Ligand binder design. Structure first.
Ligand SMILES: CN[C@@H]1[C@@H](O)[C@@H](O[C@@H]2[C@@H](O)[C@H](O[C@H]3O[C@H](CN)CC[C@H]3N)[C@@H](N)C[C@H]2N)OC[C@]1(C)O
Ligand SMILES: [Mg+2]
Ligand SMILES: [Mg+2]
Ligand SMILES: [Mg+2]
Ligand SMILES: [Mg+2]
Ligand SMILES: [Mg+2]
Ligand SMILES: [Mg+2]
Ligand SMILES: [Mg+2]
Ligand SMILES: [Mg+2]
Ligand SMILES: [Mg+2]
Ligand SMILES: [Mg+2]
Ligand SMILES: [Mg+2]
Ligand SMILES: [Mg+2]
Ligand SMILES: [Mg+2]
Ligand SMILES: [Mg+2]
Ligand SMILES: [Mg+2]
Ligand SMILES: [Mg+2]
Ligand SMILES: [Mg+2]
Ligand SMILES: [Mg+2]
Ligand SMILES: [Mg+2]
Ligand SMILES: [Mg+2]
Ligand SMILES: [Mg+2]
Ligand SMILES: [Mg+2]
Ligand SMILES: [Mg+2]
Ligand SMILES: [Mg+2]
Ligand SMILES: [Mg+2]
Ligand SMILES: [Mg+2]
Ligand SMILES: [Mg+2]
Ligand SMILES: [Mg+2]
Ligand SMILES: [Mg+2]
Ligand SMILES: [Mg+2]
Ligand SMILES: [Mg+2]
Ligand SMILES: [Mg+2]
Ligand SMILES: [Mg+2]
Ligand SMILES: [Mg+2]
Ligand SMILES: [Mg+2]
Ligand SMILES: [Mg+2]
Ligand SMILES: [Mg+2]
Ligand SMILES: [Mg+2]
Ligand SMILES: [Mg+2]
Ligand SMILES: [Mg+2]
Ligand SMILES: [Mg+2]
Ligand SMILES: [Mg+2]
Ligand SMILES: [Mg+2]
Ligand SMILES: [Mg+2]
Ligand SMILES: [Mg+2]
Lengths: 79, 185
RNA sequence: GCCUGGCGGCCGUAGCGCGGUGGUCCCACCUGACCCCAUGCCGAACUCAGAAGUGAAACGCCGUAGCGCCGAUGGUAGUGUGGGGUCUCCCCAUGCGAGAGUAGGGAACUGCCAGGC
RNA sequence: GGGCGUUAAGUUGCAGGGUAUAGACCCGAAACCCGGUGAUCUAGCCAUGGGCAGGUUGAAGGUUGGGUAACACUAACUGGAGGACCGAACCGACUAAUGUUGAAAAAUUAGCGGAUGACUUGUGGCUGGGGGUGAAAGGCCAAUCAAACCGGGAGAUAGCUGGUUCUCCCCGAAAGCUAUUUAGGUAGCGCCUCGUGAAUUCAUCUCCGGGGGUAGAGCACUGUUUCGGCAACAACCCGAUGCAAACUGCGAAUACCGGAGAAUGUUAUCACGGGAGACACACGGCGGGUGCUAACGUCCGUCGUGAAGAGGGAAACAACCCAGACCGCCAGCUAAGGUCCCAAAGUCAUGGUUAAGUGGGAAACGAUGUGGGAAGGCCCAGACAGCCAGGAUGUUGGCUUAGAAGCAGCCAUCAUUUAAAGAAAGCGUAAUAGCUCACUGGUCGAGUCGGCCUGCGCGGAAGAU
RNA sequence: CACAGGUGGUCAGGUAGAGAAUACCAAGGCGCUUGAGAGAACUCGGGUGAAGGAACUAGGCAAAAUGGUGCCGUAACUUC
RNA sequence: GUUUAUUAAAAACACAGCACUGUGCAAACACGAAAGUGGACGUAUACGGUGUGACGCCUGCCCGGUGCCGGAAGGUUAAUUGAUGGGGUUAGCGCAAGCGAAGCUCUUGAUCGAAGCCCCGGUAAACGGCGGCCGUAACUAUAACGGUCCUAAGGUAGCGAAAUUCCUUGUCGGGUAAGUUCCGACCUGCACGAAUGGCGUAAUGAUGGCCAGGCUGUCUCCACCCGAGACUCAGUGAAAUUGAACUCGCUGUGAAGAUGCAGUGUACCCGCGGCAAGACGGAAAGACCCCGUGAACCUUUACUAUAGCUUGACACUGAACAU
RNA sequence: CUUUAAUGUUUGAUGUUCUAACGUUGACCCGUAAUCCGGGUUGCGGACAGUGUCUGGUGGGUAGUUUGACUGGGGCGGUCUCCUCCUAAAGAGUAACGGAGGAGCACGAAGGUUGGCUAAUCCUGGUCGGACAUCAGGAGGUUAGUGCAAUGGCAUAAGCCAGCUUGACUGCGAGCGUGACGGCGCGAGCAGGUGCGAAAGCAGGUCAUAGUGAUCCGGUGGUUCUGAAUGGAAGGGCCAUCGCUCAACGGAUAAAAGGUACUCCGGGGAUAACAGGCUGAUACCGCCCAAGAGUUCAUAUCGACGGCGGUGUUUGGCACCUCGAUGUCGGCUCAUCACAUCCUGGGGCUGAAGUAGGUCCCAAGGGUAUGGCUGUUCGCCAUUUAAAGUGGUACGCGAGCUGGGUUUAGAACGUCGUGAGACAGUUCGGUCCCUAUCUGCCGUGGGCGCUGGAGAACUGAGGGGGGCUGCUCCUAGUACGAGA
């Protein structure tokens, strides 16, 4: 009694693990409530309201680490 | 104020009432084979009336003789001067560190007054205990109605209540029965 | 090749502490301040015009292991597939194999330009 | 720019799959509505006739006498009332038995109630169905009543139940998700079938590229927890030890996502469209919530099986082990499991254990059972057991206690004499006494004592044909 | 149903009796449309029981008992 | 007396008596769409309705809620009347913009408007209600007594462990050898209480409970006996049920209680009379339980309607006069 | 004419009088040797009453209906939508009536942008300042803070301050994420115009993830879209937007509470009750350690704190078998098994003098009470007894008996409900069916077989029946005992 309830779906993860077809703008990661869990960088960026790693122009997902104090950092180079 | 708390409450109140029972019982002269008889006997000493026990020792060597041992001699004297002053009509004997109080076979009249006292007290007790339930129950009705307890929860509570009551009644029953045997022995 | 400044690389064996050391080259601090511009007070910081002064501080170096940090070999836990014994647990075959800890490492290493010797 | 479109071959018959409206596969309600038929049963009432053997009680009124001023009042006799009394007929129905496929769809038998009355009965009439009638039970209204019966609306409706008829061939599920006055129904999605299209598409293995915070571990963080260190008892902090689903400065296996490649796989794959059924799952393995790490329990994840799978195995056993049945064969080999007989195959070989019918049910704990492996201690300055001797003094230690003298209890537990001798190990006394014990000397003449690592047994172990 | 049920009115003999109760008979009408044996447990309907007497049982259920006329006599209570 | 024809005869209904209330006659009411009819050829000592239920002693407190009775001054309010303002259109005025009468129209609702409701007073033999908390006396325990919270009022007389009492076999007394029943009490009345009457009460009762005497096969504890079946014979001649029967015990197994599976034990074949332990025996698609966007009656301040009752407007429907 | 009165007149309110409608269930006449009906006369009442259309109130008298679901049977209690975490086995996702919490909003700034700033806490030192007000230094390092849950994030700070503002803009949208769907979310960039800044740029609301309602039906503003002969207009469309704790939150109606024991129908053992089963926490029984009491003395007898089992036997849990019916408790009747033995039989220990006991072990042959009270079983009591055992057997036993309890229909009380009705409260009353085919028992025959057929008499493999016990005397008033 008076103990239940729960949220819902809300994925928030990687939808483009490593290099991908990465169209004009997929996601490669929608882990909202973040900035450092997946820092914006390289050709890719955006990171809209819901901290969703936008990912600009086409290419390939990178997944970095560059930058003082760890810091994930993602970007999308080309082939 | 919870079901459990109330539970502890009923048990408590009944414990107090039961204790009053023992108070009345021991305050009586069975076949007078009981040492508790003179326990509450507060005697004058140092300006105050100290309850005999905190001044002497009352033991029943045999069913026909009660003894009051007092570490203090002066207290022993004043103790005897207190074992009487009542319907007890006990005559303390001065010999050593204690008092020898022969329990004369009890008259049939005093036997009357005594057994009856045991019954009147017994029922009195029951009454209290029963009423205690009555109250506890009401409190339960207001509880289940207030906290919204499933018919099963509330009834269950009732069961617990009755249980407590029944036990105590049993306690008052025994005390009354044993005390009686003493008076009839 | 020495030293320094700016910009980055890489982000702890690159950090912290402790001691030595460098200077009117470069940095500092510093002089002054109506003025540009500045203080919810203050030329403290920002900002400007610049002596004298000095490396104190800050900083840049050198040594130093007390505190971080890195870290095996081996052994342990766990585990994918197969199999076996059992009350919840574990064993064997076989790949994978931490963590913690031990040995030890360790007082960064770099590229571009500029300025002095 | 983005959406919808752009030589998209249509269309009309015939056969068929589907759907809609209809009874729509078939059989079935309880009911609802309309129009009639019924008071020859029963319930009231109306009109008119009939009936109650016998026996009893004795009211009111009356007459005479008493009495009264007169009335009250009184006593005899007379009289003959009454939902009055007893009790046949008659009416009823309180009890029991028997009957219960009866003699009988309510009776028979032995008892029972009323019996001049709110009585009982024959005859005919009047009340009609949501209506009647009812000394009120929801009772009676034709063996029917919380709305009679007959015919019709009418094949009411039935997300429910049952059942659904010839043969062979190919494929072959689901018991899930999400919605639902939804929960045993439904609808889109999922899974099946069939057709039409499409690319190394899809799968497994190899390598390459990724993020990860589970197992595990750890204790900086959030809590929890000990033990020590600086706190007129403890926070903080220092170090040493643990704990966590909602702890993480560490971190697997692993799955998953993507790239490339070999082989293999009667396109396995993707899309569109016709046809479905299904949306109770069950067991077992592993990861788990709950529940008692209870249940042939319940709820998720995931795999296998059954469901929808026979055969062999486990005695017998949908799920578990093996293994997927096109058919015929009096052939051969194997899986699982087996090889003394029932009963197909070794009374097989080698070394060892076990002795309880363990095998072929069960724990904590208990015991010179017993097989193996390493290791220690004491000992011919005689070990180990038994046997002979000893075990004293201060002191009855102090306290306590009625007493406590080795032996209720508390404290102390030394010293002296020695070959040895506890302020004493148990029994015992009221307390002493007394007995045995430690330990010591001699005897005895070669090993003895317990632990450790492991294997097999024993007890503990009581149930109903 | 060739069914132990239901069905109104009329008549009213003799003995005993209060009697249309009941018992035996008159007139009158009948033996009930399967019979014969046997003489079990047990069911059914009954008769009788030593001693005891409600011990039965939910309960005296059911049985047993009581029974008539005249006279004697009859309590609490009472609306007499 | 009456009643569940066919499990309930009662403590139920009914009744004489009581009380309330409606009813002025063309009565109230009831049947009927209506005409009309019963009430009643009655007329308030009469008739209807409701509740109580001889008789005796009685019948307290509450009108806050609901209903009913009386008042309606004021507040609100139906149909109705339609003042008033807004709009469509268009003659004309105007390159035009826009303006716009009249008429026809769509809309607006002033104003008028009864009962009802609010409101005001009453009504309990109307429906219906009638309390909590704390303190105190010279044994103690107890509390007439005081105080405190709140009611529409706080249950009076009487009665109480009762057809009401859960705890419960309350405690006490009587009966008994022993009494969860019974009788008499106490009062702590879970949760009596005064006409949905309280307490009594002679007589009555196929009424509930308790006790006794008598009586007995009711029983201890059955035994005998007379008759009807049962049994044998002769004639006629059913029934339910029924997948197929070659229709054993046990122990296990198993859709979880086996004649049929496994293991085992046992057992020549078939009748007749008896018994009922099993065939989850026979009989009725469980009446309990739950489900169905099932059913039927029933209640009511569930909803939406409606007969009836009652309001006012206009109509049938007219003439005057006062204010 | 305006503000007021008078007379004319009109008309509205109340109120009186009148007759001529309308009524008359007064009287009389005729129809007519009528009680209806009609016409007439007279009296009464009289525009009232009454009826029609409309209309406000009242209206369980009646009528059609509603009155949810999940639910470890139903009910009760709770829940129903959205957000956060764990359950979630390191991608997404995943259940319970699992464990914990929040939301139904707040903001014209708490939005934007530019520029600047950085905490918490402690120590030390300071008027009042003290535990903690403000000030100075040091340590410290984000442990603060973030509008509100939880999570994650945040120093380039979202955290904090100020200046200027309206990007909380309009039209669109490469491409993705997520859903059955309806939808929902992210979005660089393009066009138009804005704001901040020198500028590079940033701004399509807030750190983000909750702060929610489809459709229909209408309301309002805009628009040459439409406009039924045509011109208009009404209305419809289109765009903007408003209205529902429709919260049972995919929202059946605008509108809905209940009772049934008077009940009924279709279904379910998909689902409770009984008894079987699985289980065995609980229950009963046994064992482990032994602090304690037992004078002393742990284990004669007993045992704390805690440990482990066994049984199927209680209280339960599950819902596997029966809901096209498996009759419930108690009694009666007749049993049958178990042994955790009550009696009797044999023993060990004793805190066993004896006689009597206490406790453990063995043992299932046989035996193991009548009444009172209640329906009871149980239980309490009276009196017996060698003893009055415990339990399995569908809590053995209804196709064997009863029918007292207990669940139909009657009725009543207390009680609750406006009420119908209701109660695991009470009270008085309340139809108990079956001829046995199969098994199995119990008895009794008919066959055939046992190797020629008989009449007999035995043997005895097996099987069953029966197995109780008191008291008195003698031993011996002895052993024993101080005596008793
Ligand atoms: C509990 N028993 C009580 C007893 O204690 C006594 O109680 C009264 C109580 O009834 C009074 O109460 C009275 O006054 C109240 C306003 N003050 C309103 C109620 C009214 N009865 C009290 N004022 C005084 C008590 N001693 O008298 C009545 C009684 C019933 O016997
Ligand atoms: Mg008769
Ligand atoms: Mg009679
Ligand atoms: Mg007739
Ligand atoms: Mg039709
Ligand atoms: Mg049909
Ligand atoms: Mg772990
Ligand atoms: Mg995973
Ligand atoms: Mg479903
Ligand atoms: Mg399902
Ligand atoms: Mg499942
Ligand atoms: Mg299961
Ligand atoms: Mg063989
Ligand atoms: Mg064995
Ligand atoms: Mg005949
Ligand atoms: Mg015949
Ligand atoms: Mg006799
Ligand atoms: Mg009788
Ligand atoms: Mg009847
Ligand atoms: Mg009857
Ligand atoms: Mg009455
Ligand atoms: Mg009465
Ligand atoms: Mg009254
Ligand atoms: Mg009484
Ligand atoms: Mg008796
Ligand atoms: Mg015959
Ligand atoms: Mg024959
Ligand atoms: Mg069996
Ligand atoms: Mg029979
Ligand atoms: Mg049957
Ligand atoms: Mg059924
Ligand atoms: Mg209705
Ligand atoms: Mg309908
Ligand atoms: Mg439901
Ligand atoms: Mg996950
Ligand atoms: Mg926010
Ligand atoms: Mg919903
Ligand atoms: Mg049914
Ligand atoms: Mg089931
Ligand atoms: Mg059960
Ligand atoms: Mg069963
Ligand atoms: Mg034994
Ligand atoms: Mg008896
Ligand atoms: Mg008994
Ligand atoms: Mg029967
Ligand atoms: Mg009964």
């Amino acid at each position: 009694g008076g103990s239940t309830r729960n949220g819902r779906d809300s994925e928030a993860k990687r939808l483009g693990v490593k290099r991908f077809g990465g169209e004009s703008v997929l996601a490669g990661s929608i882990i909202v409530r973040q900035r450092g869990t997946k820092f914006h960088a390289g050709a890719n960026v955006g990171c809209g309201r819901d901290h969703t790693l936008f990912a600009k122009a086409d290419g390939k997902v990178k997944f970095e680490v560059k930058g003082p104090k760890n810091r994930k950092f993602i970007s999308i180079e080309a082939e | 104020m919870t079901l459990k708390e109330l539970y502890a409450e009923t048990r408590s109140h009944m414990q107090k009432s039961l204790e009053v029972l023992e108070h009345n019982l021991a305050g009586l002269r069975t076949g007078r084979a009981n040492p508790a008889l003179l326990l509450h006997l507060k005697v004058e000493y140092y300006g105050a009336h100290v309850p005999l026990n905190q001044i002497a020792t009352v033991t029943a060597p045999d069913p026909r003789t009660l003894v009051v041992q007092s570490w203090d001699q002066n207290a022993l004297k004043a103790i005897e001067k207190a074992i009487r002053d009542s319907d007890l009509g006990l005559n303390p004997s001065n010999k050593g560190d204690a008092l020898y109080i022969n329990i004369p076979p009890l008259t049939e009249e005093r036997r009357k007054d005594l057994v009856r006292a045991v019954r009147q007290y017994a029922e009195e007790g029951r009454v209290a205990i029963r009423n205690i339930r009555r109250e506890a129950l009401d409190k339960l009705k207001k509880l289940a109605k207030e906290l919204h307890l499933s018919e099963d929860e509330t009834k269950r509570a009732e069961a617990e209540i009755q249980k407590i009551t029944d036990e105590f009644i049993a306690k008052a029953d025994q005390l009354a029965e044993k005390k009686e045997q003493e008076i009839l022995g």
